[PDB]
């Protein structure tokens, strides 16, 4: 973040979509929730129909409990790419945010079967399985999540 402040010109910083993604993810990692949202909104303003990684935005926006923004983003993302696992994981995050979670589990496993090498979908599955008051399924899903990404 200090390198952004010092070594990155402002005009490049506030216009580069990839830099916006990186700064939002970074401020998530420092658990700076307010900071990341107002730049992810700028990202969506620059282009709404981009998937890349909305997994971070879905994780943030579940915490912020903004149902309408999640609905709009899920609609757009799936209407653009139906086969991208990120759209399905965002949809499942929305569903878990609502209330029901078994269909969220089904959506997550479907997202994984789109791409078996998407670790974050697995770990989101595992974290959700804690909300089911079930551990064995959660434990197996956590192990299978860590298998895909060694450093998670």
């Amino acid at each position: 973040i200090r390198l952004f402040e010092s070594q990155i010109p402002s005009h490049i910083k506030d216009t580069m979509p990839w830099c916006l993604v990186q700064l939002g993810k970074l401020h998530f990692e420092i658990i700076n929730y307010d900071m990341s949202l107002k730049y992810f909104n700028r990202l969506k303003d620059l282009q709404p129909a981009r998937v890349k990684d909305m997994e971070i935005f879905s994780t943030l926006l579940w915490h912020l409990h903004d149902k309408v923004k999640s609905s709009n983003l899920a609609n757009g993302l799936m209407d653009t790419m139906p086969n991208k696992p990120e759209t399905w994981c965002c949809i499942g995050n929305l569903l878990s945010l609502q209330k029901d979670h078994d269909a969220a589990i089904k959506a997550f496993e479907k997202a994984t079967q789109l791409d078996p090498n998407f670790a974050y979908a697995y770990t989101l599955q595992g974290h959700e399985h804690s909300s089911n008051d079930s551990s064995d399924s959660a434990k197996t899903c956590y192990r299978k999540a860590l298998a895909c990404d060694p450093q998670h």
Binding site: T59, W62, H63, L124, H127
Partner: peptide
């Protein structure tokens, strides 16, 4: 056991049943 119902009923429902025993976060 449910041997008889009200007003000389025949069958019986069961709306709810539960069993009780004794003994901030990140996504």
């Amino acid at each position: 056991l449910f041997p008889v119902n009200h007003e000389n009923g025949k069958d019986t429902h069961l709306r709810g049943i539960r069993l009780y025993v004794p003994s901030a976060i990140l996504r």
